[PDB]
Design a protein around this ligand. Structure first.
Ligand SMILES: CCCCCCCCCCCCCCCCCC(=O)OC[C@H](COP(=O)([O-])OCC(O)COP(=O)([O-])OC[C@@H](COC(=O)CCCCCCCCCCCCCCCCC)OC(=O)CCCCCCCCCCCCCCCCC)OC(=O)CCCCCCCCCCCCCCCCC
Ligand SMILES: CCCCCCCCCCCCCCCCCC(=O)OC[C@H](COP(=O)([O-])OCC(O)COP(=O)([O-])OC[C@@H](COC(=O)CCCCCCCCCCCCCCCCC)OC(=O)CCCCCCCCCCCCCCCCC)OC(=O)CCCCCCCCCCCCCCCCC
Ligand SMILES: CCCCCCCCCCCCCCCCC[C@@H](O)O[C@H](CO[C@H](O)CCCCCCCCCCCCCCC)COP(=O)(O)OCC[N+](C)(C)C
Ligand SMILES: CCCCCCCCCCCCCCCCC[C@@H](O)O[C@H](CO[C@H](O)CCCCCCCCCCCCCCC)COP(=O)(O)OCC[N+](C)(C)C
Ligand SMILES: CCCCCCCC/C=C\CCCCCCCC(=O)OC[C@H](COP(=O)(O)OCCN)OC(=O)CCCCCCC/C=C\CCCCCCCC
Ligand SMILES: CCCCCCCC/C=C\CCCCCCCC(=O)O[C@H](COC(=O)CCCCCCC/C=C/CCCCCCCC)COP(=O)(O)OCCN
Ligand SMILES: CCCCCCCCCCCC(=O)SCCNC(=O)CCNC(=O)[C@H](O)C(C)(C)COP(=O)(O)O
Lengths: 55, 124, 88, 178, 103, 128, 70, 55, 84, 459
């Protein structure tokens, strides 16, 4: 709808002099588009495996 | 494509290469030399932040299409008139680029003919 | 899987079914204790052919050192049951 | 697997094994059934034309160019049964075969369940305990001096006797324990 | 070729013993003994204890701890087109220069 | 005729194509019989030690102990300094060290010289 | 979860009507979607703009002078 | 007008008219031809002939 | 709940080479003077519901009839509704 | 710091006056309490140090090693509890006394504000180790291993004493603070070159450097379990700590004097990683893996950049924990098998699942899997060496690939596959071994949450 774009750096892991390493998530177009596709495929695969490997 | 076969099987200097074009001055053809017009300013193109490769002479229709797509969101196929206009203008730009290529080819042809005629006249 | 637990009389029925369609031997004369080399006059190559026929039809393959010493349907049934661990 | 091997293979054994391998690879080449039957009959025809040869020198000269012909057209990707030593499920269930002696290490709380099974297990253990003491003497008195010449074991001869070295063979995890 | 009599006898006896053992592997109806001792609705509670609570915790953590520090959450500025109006200021963006429109 | 199969180190000759067992003599049969005899003797000993109900341990295998001792603890006493061994040791233990030293020395000299002359563009190279 | 289907041993397996009708319905849905999309839009498949021929373009608009002026 | 069309067709068109290596063009075209070929092989060998599985 | 119903095997007289493409194999074997002993063993692969096969093209357009009918109905409805 | 040293000393009268059947409980409980007390040293400051007195001082480099040393003793006692079941009370008390003395010497060594005291204790840590290896060793090669371990160390360390007394005579003080503040450049001369060699080789032989590592496989194979853990975990880090301490006076000689050792280490990592592939023994494989990791640490220390030092400290801690866990697992396997050979026992995952899980976790940690501190140190050293020269990446990547290969090979050979048929004494794993593995592994996955505690003074 909008084209919302966002990166979240919640937890600051450690600082090495002038470098900062923090737990940063990028929620760009690629990520926000690939999360639902991967989740849908995994859901279908898990439902199929509930039958394939019952034994 | 036939042009590639012509260049790699005929004479290389007969027709140009995409890397070095254009090789002749713009005013060689006709002296009026009309200037291309751009209807989208720097600031509004920056505000729309299209792309670096999308900021060409066809930008106004792209901005209109983006405005439509943002406005009528739930109906994802709501407007196609501005989409068709954007493709039509892109097709026109491609036509102009092909015009540049053919103009360069024919001008190089005429230059080669002139050089051959001058050499023959000097020899004769 | 849903594989039914195949049993000895089912195995014997399968062996007799495969053998009875082997036209080189008459179904009436054959018996589950009948031999191959003497009681039916079958060649060694023919015996290899029946061994491969059971191989194809049962879905499991018998090693050569064990296949060449099977001469009766009863011992074929016994070998298959031993391989597939059949109770009754 | 069950039968003990001999020191060498006779000429008939080699011929039969070559015939089986050739038919298998021919079936692999000809996917459909009718083609397989036709060419298998042709192969049998070309195979039995030298059945009645007498001299072993020429027969050994044969089955040598035959092996080369087989190796030239051996279908580099043959069909292998799923449980065969080359199949897709060769050793699939080998991670489920738990040895029987593991049950000797179970906690008494775990042995509280399945009590009749463990009673039968104790009965089997006593049977093995007596049978082993009989089998060692039987095997000692039956084997020839200088050590056995082949790995073939004799059966039980008396009434109460049991076949020597039967514990490993008799009890197994299963073909498909889980 | 074929089985030797000793081989046949040994195989028969081994087969009998193997079948006896395999039959002994069965379970009686009472064999598994379990000692008992204790100390839309399904989806309704699932969406409550698995979706709603993580949403609450994440929202609290993000909105009063993450954004308290500067630049932790930075969002791409929304695209501005000719014709829209800004909520913060109320000014209107001037439109285009009426490009010639044919086809 | 058919193209021949040429065996190599990593693709050995198949048993069927091998001609050793097609030249059959009585001494070959005797050799095969003796091989089967010793193999069956070892198998019988292993099976006797294997089915014993009284045994509650690991069957000590002399071959495994012999292999481990030969691989690990019996190398030096059988070692002799010979031109082949000395040359191989010198090469494989000295050549790589000097080769890598030369490579890194030239690379670092080139970088250090570029640092002196100043055309390296070390901008933003803060961490080191 | 399903119904009880028994083996056949050299006969055709039992087929429930549900899977047959579902498969036929989904194949029909795919073909209907293909036909509808193609009918609605023929441009994606064949192009929506003619390709100009560069030979027909006259020398006037390309600024070619007849080998004498310059 | 299937799911794979909207990606693969545009991939082929974009590859066809860019200043790229010609050998890559040829290999891509042969690769998609072989893709169709092996899909045909799967369908033909798994769904067309007479049954060949155990009885 | 498992598959325990005591399945009965069919009779062995049912399977005949007749009506199958094994006739060509048998005739070409008899022309050179042989026969296939295992000819009947695979007759079941051509006897029952497996007798009728579908061509690759015919398999491809599995549901053209229903889809075409639905497409024609939809186009007619759209034509008669938009023309208003 | 006497609040740590005094209880360690009191551990001896405690264990000697304890009952015959309660020595292990008392020793374990009070050593865990000592570790809890020693946890307070981790609170360092960005300034100089925690100068306790004129004799002991604590930095943020000595604090992690001190904590690891104090934490290792309970695991040593829990591991040694198995094979000492049939041992008399006096000899068990002597073993515990030797372990306590080793801990006390290491604790006094790691702070040691003066260099001569550091050398005295860093050579004193050699007697209890030799006694443990030579006395409570199973194989008949323990005597040769003890002789090798003693002499390889002492030959390197003897010139260090002469170098230290010469430095005291010229400079005038061997206190570390005065050394650091009054440091002056060493001119390029033969005498200074030999001073550098004398000061460096003593620590390089102990890590060890490739070419001087012959003592480590023998000492690790022949020693008992506790000796193996104390060798792989702490006693190797003595060389690294010593060199990071002493290299403050060898500049700028070190820039051009590090080339032979750098090349030796960067090729010996590959050589020992390859050696790990074709190994018929387990403890030898873990020993060679330790040699490879210590070669990487040597490279990091010789590079002499802040990231090199941080990665070196992290790698030392991580490798100590991982090697101790691996030696523990190998010892538990050997106790049941009684053979110590990789391919004799196979497919143990089907029989002992939880031990297979511990094997998998230990292999993953040794494999330098992110975000464990193993990979933190590894990657820091990789980046520092890349800054040193862009061609080091080839050797480092080859080492990483071979490390993964041999780790997964060790896991697969002993866990996957079909079980050996003729082994029927694989009793289920006790609670002691599972607790030992858990106490080995949980600190690693806890330290991966707070890396700054083990990143050294240059953080
Ligand atoms: C730190 C990280 C790792 C690094 C450490 C590991 C690597 C470094 C250390 C190890 C490598 C160092 C080895 C070099 C010295 C060791 C040789 C030694 O001790 O001699 C023992 C040994 C004692 O003599 P011997 O036992 O009485 O005679 C035994 C032979 O059968 C009799 O031999 P022969 O009579 O048949 O032929 C001998 C003759 C023949 O020469 C050759 O065959 C080839 C030429 C080799 C050297 C010339 C180039 O050789 C010469 O005349 C060369 C003289 C110059 O001598 C040898 O066998 C070796 C002779 C060849 C010398 C090769 C040295 C060159 C190596 C590069 C430097
Ligand atoms: C993914 C995040 C999960 C978050 C949930 C919280 C999980 C907390 C776990 C804390 C550490 C686990 C304790 C280690 C021993 C396990 C106890 C045991 O024996 O199992 C028996 C127990 C009961 O099973 P059983 O049937 O009775 O026993 C049968 C046998 O044991 C048969 O055993 P099995 O067949 O069931 O297999 C045992 C299983 C469990 O055993 C293990 O292998 C667990 C150890 C895995 C670590 C491997 C070392 C690499 C370095 C990772 C360092 C991260 C630590 C962070 C802080 C941890 C705080 C303690 O192994 C595995 O499943 C394969 C593990 C390989 C995973 C590779 C991925 C590593 C990197 C993932 C990202 C980490 C940072 C994320 C940053 C960005 C996102 C926020 O099973 C469990 O308890 C499973 C626990 C869950 C598995 C955790 C695996 C990934 C989580 C790693 C730490 C979480 C990071 C924080 C994320 C928060 C969001
Ligand atoms: C709700 C709370 C959540 C967090 C809880 C945190 C729990 C922390 C407890 C663990 C402590 C870690 C060990 C660190 C102790 C070392 C510090 C020690 O040296 O300090 C001493 C003092 O420490 C305490 O007095 C005693 C610490 C020992 C007790 C630890 C608490 C838990 C131990 C329980 C063990 C056994 C439990 C029961 C077994 C059955 C003396 O220092 P001092 O040089 O004078 O200080 C001078 C400054 N003054 C003047 C302001 C005082
Ligand atoms: C085997 C397992 C590992 C053991 C440890 C190995 C590490 C120790 C090896 C020693 C490292 C280098 C030592 C000296 C480096 C200085 C550079 C010098 O060697 O090169 C030239 C020196 O030329 C010659 O090399 C002179 C020395 C030659 C004699 C030394 C023996 C060489 C081979 C012996 C190797 C044996 C090592 C193992 C002993 C057991 C430079 O010429 P120059 O610029 O003018 O002099 C520099 C010094 N100045 C500036 C103070 C004047
Ligand atoms: C759980 C049950 C309780 C739920 C109620 C509480 C809800 C949230 C409110 C908690 C208050 C926020 C809080 O915890 O403090 C922030 C606190 C850290 O404090 P800071 O000062 O911001 O950074 C450290 C440097 N000073 O943040 C947290 O620790 C909580 C969230 C952190 C992420 C959770 C852990 C996930 C990652 C695990 C480690 C993986 C390895 C490292 C990843 C490598 C990335 C490069
Ligand atoms: C596992 C085995 C490792 C073996 C390690 C042993 C070798 C270590 C290197 C040599 C150690 C001895 C060095 C001497 C101690 C340092 C003291 C010092 O530096 O003082 C120098 C003195 O330097 C020396 O005297 C050095 C002489 C060395 C003699 C002994 C030689 C031993 C072997 C040396 C060659 C091997 C070196 C590499 C060994 C590699 C490992 C095998 C200054 O002299 P001044 O009198 O003050 O002069 C000032 C006025 N001009
Ligand atoms: C696609 C790959 C094709 C590969 C083709 C391989 C080559 C095919 C042609 C092989 C040529 C030969 O037959 S090589 C001929 C080898 N020599 C003999 O056959 C002589 C005597 N044969 C016997 O005695 C046997 O036992 C026998 C009578 C056969 C059976 O006997 P039984 O049954 O009573 O036991």
């Amino acid at each position: 709808h909008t084209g919302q774009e966002m990166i979240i750096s919640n937890w600051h892991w450690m600082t090495l002099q002038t470098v900062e390493l923090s737990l940063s998530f990028k929620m760009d177009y690629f990520s926000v588009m690939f999360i639902p596709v991967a989740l849908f495929v995994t859901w279908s695969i898990m439902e199929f495996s509930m039958w394939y490997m019952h034994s | 494509g036939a042009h590639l076969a012509r260049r790699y099987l005929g004479d290389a200097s007969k027709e140009p290469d995409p890397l070095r074009m254009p090789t002749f001055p713009p005013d060689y053809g006709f002296p009026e030399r009309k200037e291309r017009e751009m209807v989208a300013t720097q600031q509004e193109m920056n505000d729309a932040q299209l792309m670096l490769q999308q900021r060409d002479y066809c930008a106004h229709y792209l901005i209109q299409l983006l405005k439509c797509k943002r406005d009528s969101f739930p109906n994802f196929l709501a407007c196609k008139h501005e989409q068709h206009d954007w493709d039509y203008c892109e097709h026109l730009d491609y036509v102009k680029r092909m015009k540049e290529f053919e103009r360069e080819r024919r001008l190089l042809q005429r230059k080669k003919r002139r050089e051959q005629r001058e050499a023959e006249m000097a020899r004769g | 899987s849903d594989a039914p637990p195949l049993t000895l009389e089912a195995i014997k029925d399968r062996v007799l079914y495969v053998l009875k369609l082997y036209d080189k031997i008459d179904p009436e004369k054959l018996s589950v204790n009948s031999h191959f080399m003497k009681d039916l006059g079958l060649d060694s190559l023919d015996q290899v052919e029946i061994i491969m026929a059971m191989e194809d039809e049962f879905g499991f393959e018998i090693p050569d050192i064990d296949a060449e010493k099977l001469m009766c349907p009863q011992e074929i049934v016994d070998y298959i049951a031993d391989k597939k661990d059949v109770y009754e | 697997a069950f039968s003990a091997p001999a020191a060498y293979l006779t000429h008939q054994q080699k011929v039969l094994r070559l015939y089986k391998r050739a038919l298998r690879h021919l079936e692999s080449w000809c996917v459909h059934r009718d083609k397989y039957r036709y060419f298998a009959c042709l192969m049998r025809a070309r195979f039995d034309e030298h059945k009645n040869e007498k001299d072993m020198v020429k027969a050994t000269q044969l089955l040598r160019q035959a092996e080369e012909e087989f190796w030239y057209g051996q279908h580099p990707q043959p069909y292998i049964f799923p449980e065969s030593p080359g199949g897709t499920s060769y050793e699939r269930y080998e991670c489920y075969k738990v040895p029987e002696w593991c049950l000797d290490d179970w906690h008494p709380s775990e042995k509280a369940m399945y009590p009749d099974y463990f009673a039968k297990r104790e009965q089997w253990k006593r049977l093995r305990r007596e049978s082993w003491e009989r089998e060692v003497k039987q095997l000692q008195e039956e084997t020839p001096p200088g050590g056995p010449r082949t790995e073939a074991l004799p059966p039980a001869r008396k009434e109460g006797d049991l076949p020597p070295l039967w514990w490993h063979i008799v009890t197994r995890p299963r073909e498909r324990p889980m | 070729s074929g089985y030797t009599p000793d081989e046949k006898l040994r195989l028969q006896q081994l087969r009998e013993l193997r079948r006896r053992w395999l039959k002994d592997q069965e379970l009686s109806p009472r064999e598994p003994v379990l000692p008992p001792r204790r100390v839309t609705y399904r989806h309704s509670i699932f969406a409550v204890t698995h979706v709603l609570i993580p949403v609450w915790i994440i929202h609290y953590y993000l909105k009063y701890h993450v954004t308290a520090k500067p630049y932790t959450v930075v969002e791409r500025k929304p695209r501005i087109f000719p014709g829209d109006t800004i909520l913060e200021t109320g000014e209107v963006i001037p439109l285009m220069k009426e490009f010639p429109d044919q086809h | 005729s058919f193209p021949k199969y040429k065996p190599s180190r990593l693709a050995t000759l198949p048993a069927t194509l091998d001609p050793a067992e097609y030249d059959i003599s009585p001494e070959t049969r005797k050799a095969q019989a003796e091989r089967l005899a010793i193999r069956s003797r070892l198998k019988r000993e292993y099976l006797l030690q294997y089915n014993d109900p009284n045994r509650l341990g690991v069957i000590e295998d002399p071959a495994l102990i012999r292999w481990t001792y030969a691989r690990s603890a019996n190398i030096y006493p059988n070692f002799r300094p010979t031109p082949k061994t000395s040359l191989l040791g010198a090469l494989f233990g000295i050549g790589p060290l000097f080769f890598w030293y030369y490579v890194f020395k030239t690379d670092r000299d080139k970088k250090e010289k570029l640092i002196q002359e100043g055309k390296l563009d070390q901008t933003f190279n803060i961490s080191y | 979860g399903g119904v009880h289907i028994e083996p056949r041993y050299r006969q055709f397996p039992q087929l429930t009507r549900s899977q047959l009708i579902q498969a036929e319905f989904f194949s029909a849905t795919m073909w209907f979607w293909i036909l509808w999309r193609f009918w609605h839009d023929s441009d994606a498949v064949l192009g929506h703009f003619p390709y100009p021929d560069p030979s027909q373009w006259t020398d006037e608009e390309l600024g070619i002078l007849p080998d004498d002026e310059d | 007008y299937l799911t794979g069309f909207y990606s693969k067709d545009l991939i082929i068109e974009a590859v066809n008219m860019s200043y790229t290596n010609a050998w890559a063009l040829l290999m891509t075209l042969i690769a998609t031809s072989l893709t169709a070929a092996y899909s045909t092989r799967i369908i033909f060998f798994a769904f067309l002939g007479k049954p060949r599985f155990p009885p | 709940e498992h598959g325990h119903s005591k399945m009965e095997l069919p009779d062995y007289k049912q399977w005949k080479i007749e009506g199958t493409p094994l006739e060509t194999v048998q005739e070409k074997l008899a022309a050179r003077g042989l026969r296939d002993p295992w000819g009947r063993n695979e007759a079941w692969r051509y006897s029952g519901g497996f007798a009728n096969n579908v061509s690759f093209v015919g398999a491809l357009l599995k549901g053209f009839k229903w889809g075409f009918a639905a497409f024609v109905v939809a186009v007619g409805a759209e034509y008669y509704l938009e023309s208003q | 710091m006497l609040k740590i040293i005094i209880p360690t000393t009191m551990l001896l009268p405690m264990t000697w006056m304890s009952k015959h059947n309660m020595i292990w409980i008392n020793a374990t409980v009070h050593s865990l309490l000592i570790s809890l007390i020693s946890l307070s040293l981790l609170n360092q400051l960005g300034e100089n140090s925690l100068n306790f007195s004129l004799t002991f001082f604590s930095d943020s480099l000595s604090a992690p090693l001190l904590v690891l040393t104090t934490w290792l003793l309970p695991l040593m006692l829990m591991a040694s509890q198995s094979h000492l079941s049939k041992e008399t009370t006096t000899r068990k008390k002597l073993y515990i006394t030797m372990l306590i003395l080793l801990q006390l010497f290491l604790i006094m060594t790691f702070t040691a504000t003066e260099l001569i005291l550091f050398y005295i204790l860093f050579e004193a840590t050699l007697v209890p180790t030799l006694i443990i290896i030579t006395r409570w060793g199973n194989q008949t090669e323990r005597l040769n291993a003890g002789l090798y371990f003693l002499f390889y160390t002492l030959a390197g360390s003897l010139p260090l004493l002469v170098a230290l007394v010469y430095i005291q005579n010229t400079t005038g003080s061997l206190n570390f603070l005065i050394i650091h503040y009054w440091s002056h450049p060493l001119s390029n001369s033969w005498s200074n070159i030999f001073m550098w060699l004398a000061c460096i080789m003593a620590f390089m032989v102990k890590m060890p450097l490739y070419g001087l590592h012959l003592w480590l496989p023998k000492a690790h194979v022949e020693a008992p379990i506790a000796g193996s853990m104390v060798l792989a975990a702490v006693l190797l880090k003595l060389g690294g700590y010593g060199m990071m301490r002493i290299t403050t006076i060898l500049n700028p000689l070190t820039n051009y004097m590090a080339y032979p050792f750098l090349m030796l280490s960067m090729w010996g990592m590959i050589m020992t990683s390859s050696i790990c592939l074709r190994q018929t023994d387990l403890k030898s494989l873990i020993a060679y893996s330790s040699v490879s990791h210590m070669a990487l640490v040597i490279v990091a220390i010789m590079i002499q950049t802040p990231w090199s030092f941080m990665g070196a400290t992290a790698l030392m801690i991580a490798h100590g924990l991982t090697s101790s866990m691996l030696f523990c697992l190998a010892n538990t396997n050997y106790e049941r098998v009684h053979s110590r050979t990789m391919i004799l026992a196979r497919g143990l995952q089907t029989l002992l699942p939880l031990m297979a899980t511990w094997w998998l976790v230990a292999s993953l940690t040794n494999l330098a899997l992110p975000p464990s501190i193993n990979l933190i140190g590894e990657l820091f050293i990789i980046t520092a060496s890349f800054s040193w020269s862009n061609i080091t990446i080839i050797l480092m990547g080859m080492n990483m690939m071979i490390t993964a290969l041999y780790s997964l090979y060790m896991l697969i050979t002993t866990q996957r596959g079909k079980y050996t048929h003729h082994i029927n004494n694989i009793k289920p794993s006790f609670t002691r071994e599972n607790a030992l593995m858990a106490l080995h592994i949980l600190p690693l996955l806890l330290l991966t949450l707070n890396p700054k505690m083990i990143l050294g003074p240059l953080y």
